């Protein structure tokens, strides 16, 4: 897992989010099934909810609010990449400026699956 560790007096939110997904009650311990549920939801195949698609195109975009076709083309067939480029719009950042290559998955997912 891409988790930087032991920064000099700094707090990161990835480990906190993982701990909340595993043990939301802050029990301090994870059982065999508590980690197995995370492993099963992280491993493969079937999907329960669209929220994992929501925050997994964020991880595919490496935390960026916009994604590119080149980033999508190391994981996905160019058939589906052409589909995505045809049906998903251009990204607008919080500053308001528009990249020519900026693509928003948030609006697309909330439009089709919401």
């Amino acid at each position: 897992y891409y988790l930087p560790m032991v920064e000099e007096g700094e707090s990161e939110p990835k480990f906190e989010k993982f701990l909340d997904a595993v043990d939301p009650g802050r029990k301090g311990y994870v059982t065999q099934e508590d980690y197995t549920y995370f492993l099963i939801d992280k491993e493969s195949e079937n999907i329960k909810s669209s929220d994992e698609i929501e925050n997994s195109f964020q991880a595919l975009a490496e935390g960026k609010a916009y994604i590119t076709k080149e980033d999508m083309k190391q994981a996905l067939t160019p058939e589906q990449v052409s589909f995505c480029a045809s049906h998903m719009q251009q990204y607008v950042d919080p500053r308001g400026r528009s990249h020519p290559a900026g693509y928003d998955y948030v609006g697309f997912i909330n439009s089709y699956f919401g």
Partner: protein
Amino acid sequence: QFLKEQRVHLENMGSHDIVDGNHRLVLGLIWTIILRFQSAKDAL
């Protein structure tokens, strides 16, 4: 020898070639110089 210390690869280069005034080897030396001279620790 200082250039060889920096592991810059020179071929068919000699001191007597530079002293004698050979054109091609001098130009090659200049060309080669131009190309080649411009805790978390505990967790891992």
